[PDB]
Amino acid sequence: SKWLSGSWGVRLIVEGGVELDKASSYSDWVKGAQNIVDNLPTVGHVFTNFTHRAHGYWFTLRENPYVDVAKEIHPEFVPSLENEKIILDVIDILHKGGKKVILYIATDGPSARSGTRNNAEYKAAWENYYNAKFDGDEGLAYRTLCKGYIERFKGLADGYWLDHVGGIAGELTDFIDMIREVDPSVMIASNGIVENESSNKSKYFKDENGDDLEVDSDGTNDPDGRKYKIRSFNLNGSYVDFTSGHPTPLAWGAPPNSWAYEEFTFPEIVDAMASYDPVKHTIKHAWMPMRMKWTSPRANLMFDVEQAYRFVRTLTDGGCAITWGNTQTNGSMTKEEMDIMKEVDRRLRMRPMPDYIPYKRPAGAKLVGE
Ligand SMILES: O=S(=O)(O)C[C@@H](O)CNC1CCCCC1
Ligand SMILES: O=S(=O)(O)C[C@@H](O)CNC1CCCCC1
Ligand SMILES: O=S(=O)(O)C[C@@H](O)CNC1CCCCC1
Ligand SMILES: [Ca+2]
Ligand SMILES: [Ca+2]
């Protein structure tokens, strides 16, 4: 379990399903994986894909011991037999490079009742399957489909990051139970529902009256005046091993480099890990987008090297983990981001590591309550 504590990581997006088939002719994810290994020796872990980013009906593997997905469900759910080797080769390079591998799953699956883009044809094909073979029990159908791939990733995936969990077929706990039944040693994070041991509301920082804090301004030249709440990652739900780390949503106007994360979110979990008790606690982990969008290289890059270095240092010094939300082009990390990752890595290899520039509240940055 402990490998995640103090680890920093990057994302290598691998597409799934028919989208992987379409992207394979002009992309090389093997190069992208080798690129990470060769340039980022200090990186401890890499996030990549069991499903396509944010889409539960596109998988990175094809063959499945419990279902011929192409013949029984829909051919676009799986890549070609040749292209299913992409994710396997990626994992081999990362493992051979000494990296741990966390696999992303959009758990709302083909019915797409959460963040997966709705696709009527995909949903109908899926319903035809689970009604014919599972007599209407979508939850068991979905767990069984996924089980086949969890089985194939045994020893390859070191963890799983579950998204869209409010739309999962059946009970999320049954789905997590299924994973642990296949491989009880993998680390599991869930983007909601089972992280907060105390409640099913999202956890925000609060004042003495129990009201949520709100950022008013990010600084004198804040480009977006929308106020936003500040997520806490101090979450110890029993079903998960590490915190999902999803910060306040970008679409609400919360920048991923928010000063409030340096002042509230990160110090809280650094302090939590200072008392880490594996019997009681998750490994505290942050997944911070590099840009104002998670996966679009055209979105504004929100980190320079000095702030990215402080983010990684602050969290990993304290035994937390951090993952970057990197973007990919043609199967390799976007250059402008790799340049930053490389400079972070360079500094982390120095002995002593150089001090980071101290966090100071930006000019004009303030809470509503100030
Ligand atoms: O980074 S991923 O896409 O794999 C998972 C999640 O963090 C992204 N959520 C956004 C929400 C806004 C619209 C598109 C998806
Ligand atoms: O993904 S779904 O819409 O199906 C599940 C939905 O309950 C999750 N969003 C809540 C509300 C906003 C703060 C975070 C938690
Ligand atoms: O987190 S809570 O549900 O307590 C309140 C907060 O989420 C509402 N934010 C919306 C979201 C996107 C449009 C602008 C405002
Ligand atoms: Ca949807
Ligand atoms: Ca703002």
- The conformation of residue 336, written as its DSSP 8-state character, comes to H
Burial class (CB in 10 A: 0-12, 13-18, 19+), 3: middle
- Tell whether ligand 2 has an atom less than 6 A from the beta carbon of residue 167: yes
Could you tell me which of 322, 315, 233, 244 has the C-alpha nearest to residue 8? 322
Residue whose C-alpha is closest to residue 262's, from 200, 318, 201: 318
Place of tokens 């992409």: 86
- 173, containing H or E segment: helix 172-182
Known binding residue 196? Answer is no
Q: Are 90 and 50 in contact (CB under 8 A)?
A: no
d(CA 296, CA 233): 25
Q: Please, are residues 293 and 299 in contact by the beta-carbon 8 Å criterion?
A: yes
- Structure method: X-ray
User: Phi and psi at residue 221, in whole multiples of 5°?
Assistant: -110, 35
On the CB side of 179, how many CA atoms lie within 13 Å of its CA? 26
* Listed residues: CB within 5 A of ion ligand 5: 218, 222, 224
> CA torsion sign, 218 to 223 to 225 to 231?
negative
Is the Cβ–Cβ distance between 79 and 22 less than 8 Å? no
Contact between 328 and 32 (Cβ < 8 Å): yes
C-alpha 307/C-alpha 320 separation (Å) is 17
Query: 78 CA distance to ligand 5 centroid (A)?
Result: 40
Question: CA 126 → CA 60, 71, 134, 312, distances in Å?
Answer: 17, 12, 11, 42
**Chain centre distance of CA 187:** 13
- Rounded distance, CA 125 to CA 358, Å? 54
CA 186 to each of CA 96, 136, 197, 289: distance values in angstroms, whole numbers, following the listed order:
18, 30, 21, 24
Compute the distance between CA of residue 116 and CA of residue 261 in angstroms, rounded to an integer. Answer: 28
For residue 11, the ligand 1 atom closest to its alpha carbon is 1
What is the residue with the minimal CA distance to atom 9 of ligand 2? 166
The residue type of 200 is N
- Which of 242, 239, 284, 278 is CA-nearest to residue 261? 284
**What DSSP element (H or E) covers 322?**
strand 321-325
H-helix or E-strand containing 189? strand 187-190
Dihedral, CA atoms, 324, 328, 332, 335, nearest 10 degrees?
Answer: -80
Strand partners, 322: 8, 286
β-partners of residue 328 are: 333
What spacing in Å lies between the alpha carbon of 52 and ligand 3's midpoint? 27
Is the Cβ–Cβ distance between 87 and 60 less than 8 Å?
yes
* Dist. CA 9–CA 11, nearest whole Å: 7
Tell me the H-state helices in 218-289.
Answer: 259-260, 266-273
Q: Where are the domains of the chain?
A: 2-367
Structure tokens at 325: 């939300």
Token code pair at residue 39: 């340039």
Task: Report yes or no: 204 and 212 within 8 Å, Cβ to Cβ.
Answer: yes
Ligand 1: residue whose CA is nearest its atom 6: 54
Angle at 60 between CA 54 and CA 65, to 5 degrees: 120
Amino acid letter for position 23? A
Tell whether 114 is in a known binding site: yes
Q: What is the Å distance from ligand 3's center to 47 Cα?
A: 28
Report whether 224 belongs to an annotated binding site.
yes
Asked whether the beta carbons of 78 and 146 are under 8 A apart, the reply is no
Helix (H) or strand (E) holding 365: strand 365-367
Contact 26, 114 (CB under 8 A): no
How many A from CA of 115 to the centre of ligand 1?
Answer: 8
Distance CA 54, CA 295 (A): 10
Q: What is the distance between the alpha carbons of residues 218 and 225, in angstroms, rounded to a whole number?
A: 8
HSE on the CB side for 284, CA within 13 Å? Answer: 27
Q: For the domain with range 2-367, which CATH number is right: 3.20.20, 1.10.10, 2.60.120, 3.40.720?
A: 3.20.20
Are 281 and 236 in contact, with CB atoms under 8 Å apart?
Answer: yes
Let me know: does 104 contact 47? Beta carbons within 8 Å. yes
Strand 285-289 and strand 321-325: pairing?
A: parallel
Whether the CB-CB separation of 259 and 361 falls below 8 Å is answered with yes
54 lines ligand 2 (CB under 6 A): no
